[model samples]
Target chain A: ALLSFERKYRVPGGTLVGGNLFDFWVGPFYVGFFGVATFFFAALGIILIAWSAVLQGTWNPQLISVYPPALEYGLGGAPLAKGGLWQIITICATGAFVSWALREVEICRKLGIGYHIPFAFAFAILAYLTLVLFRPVMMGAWGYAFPYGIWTHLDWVSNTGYTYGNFHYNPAHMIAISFFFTNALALALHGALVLSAANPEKGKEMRTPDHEDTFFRDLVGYSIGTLGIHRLGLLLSLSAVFFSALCMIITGTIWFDQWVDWWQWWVKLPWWANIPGGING
Target chain B: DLASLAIYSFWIFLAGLIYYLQTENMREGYPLENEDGTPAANQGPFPLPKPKTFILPHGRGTLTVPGPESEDRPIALARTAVSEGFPHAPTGDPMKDGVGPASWVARRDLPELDGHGHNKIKPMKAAAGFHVSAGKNPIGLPVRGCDLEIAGKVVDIWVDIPEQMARFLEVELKDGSTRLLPMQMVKVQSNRVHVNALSSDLFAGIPTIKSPTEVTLLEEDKICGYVAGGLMYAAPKRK
Candidate 1:
């Protein structure tokens, strides 16, 4: 149906295929992760709001400082890719541990505890694997197919004798797409590292648990700050990847050829026309 | 601070590069499926010939015109007749008067078409345009200055109002039938006809004219009037 429609309507076969791939493959990942980070911090803030109200209905502890902030600032220095995966594991583990520790202190302080290296490693592996599989599939469907609804509709043309008969078979240029999916993984790794390491110094600075003012500043400054930096870095990286992939896939000659041909056959393309990106006229 | 800015800028630049590269190779061969998830073949050439509307002129109908737009509405109209054991039974008798491939037109035979075949019925052509006979079976042909060619077998036929067109079409398969269609249905391409659509029942009320009628060739500029118009359809024959 799409092929026939394309032929009838003169929708370019090449450009539509390439443009949609870029949008679906790279766009969603960045948006999803950013949304997650935003929600995580917001929930943390709300938790502290309710926690302090129980003491005197007015006792407000600076909650933002409690969360790690190094992740955000680790951007100033060169990101340590080696520790990226490990740190994400550690940060997530720390988050879980901290939650458990608080629960124990408040409700079940009697339960005995031990090291959780296994849990941490498991969570990290799962996270990494999720990134690997989801990235390509996400781009293939959303980037290539969804955004270009018009082009996707071009498949209705009735002639079966032309080229690129199937959508999945014609992937957007793999080399360019590789850059998009990989860079996202790399940046996500780095963000995870920074968030895990920002507040080690603050933890040891005060011993008696009495210097309220000094501990307060360090906790607020280093802890939550780290998380912010990590999340922000992740967002920047993801956005960059999405936009770049979009650009690369748009001009891919292989995809552009169909578009040009369609334009030449029955419909005129808007603006300047390129007959596939690299082909000689 | 300076170093940080540089890295950030570089990251942004790299992202731009990635986008630039994605659209670089737009080749054919993509696997696509319909909303039902069934595979749809998209990779094909453009300007596919519209086979449903191809036609030739004749007399009695003496006005061999382009087919009506709805001519292809039921692309497989005669499917049942062709599928059943009645293949040879179609256009059963009146078609014996014509010679060559056009002889298949009889009241008992189904409308048969060929991709490329020399039709028997000759049409009446004047400086104004071509016309079919009022009492002859009409064959489809490319209009003057059009470059489209239609190639398909008729699955069914419908005569004119008062049931004349359908009767003629059906009877012509058994005997001989003809109709005149509007010119709008014809699309000319590269000195050839690229008919996009056509209606088979445009002027189905015309009577069947006698044989040895004159047929005009728009491009070839020649007149062929001999024998009777007996081919129910004129499209390619599948092997």
Candidate 2:
């Protein structure tokens, strides 16, 4: 039961592989080359996680987790039942993700739209890769990759963050959080602007772009206009993730000292360092 | 300052900022979702700024402000990851990535003109009687790049006529086309002109000028961007 609009825009031509082979749609969902690839790895990954739970002699989803190889293993392969499950799962997870992106590329081609979706999505993947691949490879160990888990991932982040002794002082982390908050602010403003114009008083006509423009203009003296709010949303959100990736990548690779101590640049930078230097000590 | 007078100007500035922010950024991705994707009065709160057509130079076609989305041009690299979100590894040279320092905007391909509408920058040989005086003339000087190896020899100087100053140096290698090095990057040498940007070997890739007599605005932007990019990408891991 395809909708009228869905039918109007449906296209058959833009598969990245297998010309017309895997281009068919199951119901409304596309089954492009990457789509099937996603299903395969996503299925295998779930099954492997289940095996981990069974191997631990528990069915608790909260307790189950596939751990990466020990630091002793270095970059080499590990035992099949031990860290090997994680190593294989990583490949499957990467395979699933890359294929997902490839399908989005196909979808973009099908509808003839911008690749902004894939472009923005790349940052999230990079942030994860920094933990599992790039950072670990840089540090000469696969054990640095975060263990797959439910609550354990949280513990991993906490333990990892603690390694730096208060993550708040990490300048990149600070920037990432600032952008994260700004995303919520922008989203709220955009949604409110739209809904406010849409809601009409009884028997009164709903407002317009003109009315919307005037509201911001009267209150703040400018509006972002009809098209620009989306652009702002994209930038704010992408900036959030990009900085998030940088924060993770820079953690132990660039700065080895505590983040709080990194502020020596600003602390010792001013004339106050010399004039009021004896006060703090 | 009178508090009352300052209050009125602040009002003006606030209003100007609001309008400027709204209209300037609304060029692409207009209209709201949930409501029909097309134009709906309730969906979009701010009206698009009125369209203004800009006439192009050198018989190029006109362009309108607040036009539709730009045509898609694929980037030059492929993703290393198999999934959706991964960093892209360059298929070719990374220096020309069109990023921060090595970036290039698709500007018009016409030479910037002077007050009388002639080429603003011209070789000293064509500019008539503009001889080097009072300082080291870079002409006939060998140009040393960051690598300290000679990239090319300075053949002739390009000058800005209206401003009465040197703008670029037309340098050439043994078998390569004449390249225009920006005046700002040229450091003085008694017998050689020195640059702190790219190495001698990499100088071959600086953007080329279309005409032998003049360089276009697009070429200038690309050339300048490549020079800055070298500081980051020249030898890798520049901190």
Candidate 3:
């Protein structure tokens, strides 16, 4: 049971790191990082499935057209395109949140009861959330107002019509991300401690935890590895990670030239031609 | 499509999860037995409800004598002679033809199939329990409890729905299929036909219409008027 954290998430080795401002600040950063991690992970998973699907079609040419005319224009696909990344981040946030939450609730002591909240939330908030969040964006309404982009930015918006810069720098957004990520880091640390303590090599003794509720001793048991005991939980997580990275590669590569222009990275690059008297020319 | 797949998968997973949870609670282990611990009429994918009181005698086993072969008997005889060296012995042979091996016995002469042997009773206990002559195989009634409907109407059955053979109807879709269905499923609603003799496995792929109706048994006890309209666009049976 204690091995669940290592077996599934495989979080890197580290301490809680709250001794100083920088350590505390960066310590919780992993929460946000995890949110980012799972989002990209899940995206990669989807791309793998897509790649497999494409290969299948390639093997049987009669199965599907190589370039779907409609897909090429990107005209009528899921509008989650840009905001989709946020959703992926939000989902990772959710998993980290649950991992943290279970550590807090120690509900896993109750085993099934402890697990129920996170499972229910995951099913409802994450799995069911797919098209729902995308709906507003799909309807072209996701800015500050309903179709909020129209109100937030008249020209400052991106191709998907999102006011990314404004939202990215918004104080409210920063605060929310800060709070979630801090707690996410705390949860990550908690998961780490449990993982380390439970490891056979750690030489730690199992603590007979103090509890207000006798139910933990009876109806519930240990909180240690309940998350990983879900049997396929790690596989599901790994699969999501693999596909998310794949999606990043696909979407990232395709959008790379555009992304460079959007960030104005090329303009800032030191030109070899300008260095030390126009070089060879 | 991916989103739809995700949505449907969650729903299916939840359903399966709930089912697993329920089944885990309900388990008492395979080969469910009766209260007296003899095998019941049917073993289940489902389990029998638990008994509350531990009264040893009231829960004494039942005697399952087959129903009267002839309708002329004045009273339904209660004792079933499972044979001498059976669970119970005959009290007296009041038959007009005198007591005979094949003849039915009187009501007073039976012992319960419990742990306590009625020493005077001279029947051997079965090594493994057999279904009570009364027990029948379980059928999944698609509707819960038993609600009967007909042409937007509810009708009563001759017996309470649970005690009687509840009926349902299955309409077959054409395309290389066979599996006769039971008459009970068809008889649930009034003015309905029923058949209790259908085989389950053979008709796995066929479409079904589930309701109750009665039909006149035809030559060779075939259904009269055949299946038609409302439920099916069935081809007319070759007379």
Candidate 4:
């Protein structure tokens, strides 16, 4: 049903890229230029994936994996079945993700609002691009990219982790994991705090942000306030994915030594060596 | 690959610089000053012209307050004008009615707002008389009774941004629940707040917020109504 108050805000004209073209809503879904582009890319990517599965003679989702070109290809294009399909599929996937993010941006502009949503999604796109495009180009081989498959990706991660001799010791990986862990904590506190305030026992009146601060203050001596928590959550989550991409990109490109060796500087420090009871001394 | 990466970085930097320049003159035009000092154009990048009158949701309109206009006066006047007119019943869709808690910066999808509390411009604390502080704050201070029986403790102190006063004291009970004791209704002490009259039960079932950070206009209405209802509910029993 069309709402009574909708008449005021639904008045037109805030389109960004598509002047008046493709700027209307179709049954509640806004269809802008990027929306059309998103649909095109998504359909193409899905069809190509199905075709590759057919060529591999496997309808099973788990067994269907698209491998990149052989290392000997060395940044050169491969033939049809020899990793060419994978490259096209990667392009389609990137197109789809980027188009979807742009669609979000167009919608935001239409509403006359901030650009934070697209900004956040840009980070996710950055992580994906770092994996497939950036690292592969730097390594001088398309084969450096992880294979596109449900199970194959996990295998790639495990094998790649072992290549670094314990991925746990990778400083960037440690930071990414820490960010992932703390993001969960901040979310939990925010969820519980909001829910507790909104849902006081049945028939009881709902509370305010003041009560929320009080609840945390009474228990933990301080509260991050309602606004502070959300900001903290955003920064933590974006950093987590960013560092995840960094942790992988740096593995074979910049640092060739084992991740464990990365910590050798600490053990060889002159401060510890010159100490009275030090082993080196 | 390096050239491609450099191009992408340039694009990113360009967008950022454009936005920064756009908002650089946001604070230019408000409360129009002397003609010589004013820029060639009346409006700057943001272009916030002073509102002449606030029209209510119904048909009535109100002339805004005179002179010394702050950036937020339009919002204050608009809210007052709306509420002062006939109460607007919702049209079922919370979004259309603007009753639900939506993102302030709609394009951003950021639940976190700019301000710490009520004030969006500045983080203002209550006056010295309120006994609230940034550090070693009065949140944990207990409210004592005769024979030192615990009534409740000051858990949080809410500030009135416009008035620059401590408006309410959030008092925590023996149970986990809390109630807002109006600063007028309670007496403040060094160690604790003294709720001279009402029993501990009075602090049990006040209005609560769904999300501490995102508050709705409807929710505020309910909160104020509940607190106001307390005046009669917490009154002494008839003889």
TM-score on alpha carbons, each prediction = 0.14, 0.54, 0.19, 0.56
**On residues A147-265, what C-alpha lDDT tens digit does candidate 2 reach at each position?**
99898888888988999899998999999899899999989988898877755443344555556667888989877766677889999998988888888888778887889999888
lDDT of 4 by residue, B161-183 (tens): 42334556666678876655555
Off by over 4 Å in 3: A1-134, A137-162, A195-281, B1-239
- Regions of model 1 farther than 4 Å from truth: A1-176, A198-281, B1-239
Off by over 4 Å in 4: A1-11, A274-281, B1-239
Best by lDDT: 2
- Model 3: how far residue B124 lies from native, Å: 58
What tens digits encode model 1's per-residue C-alpha lDDT throughout A135-166? 32343321121110123224322221133333
How much native contact recovery, as a fraction, does model 2 achieve? 0.00
Q: What are the per-residue Cα lDDT tens digits for candidate 3 across B94-180? A: 122211111222222222221232211111121223222342322222211112221121122211121122222233313332222
- Poorest stretch of ten by lDDT in candidate 3 chain A: A1-10
Candidate 1 backbone clash number: 183
Candidate 3: tens digits of C-alpha lDDT, residues A1-281: 11111111111111122211111112112322333444455566445434534544443423421121122323233234333333333344445554454332232221112234445445334422322233333333322111112232333234322323233433333444554455454456455544443332322232211211122335456333333323334343433433333322232223423322344453346775345544233
| lDDT score of residue A255 within candidate 4 | 92
Cα deviation in Å at residue B212, candidate 4?
Answer: 27
- Order of candidates by lDDT, top first? 2, 4, 3, 1
Winner of 3 and 4 under TM-score: 4
- Going through the candidates in order, what fraction of the true interface contacts does each contain? 0.03, 0.00, 0.00, 0.00
| lDDT measured at residue A207 in model 3 versus the true structure, 0 to 100 | 24
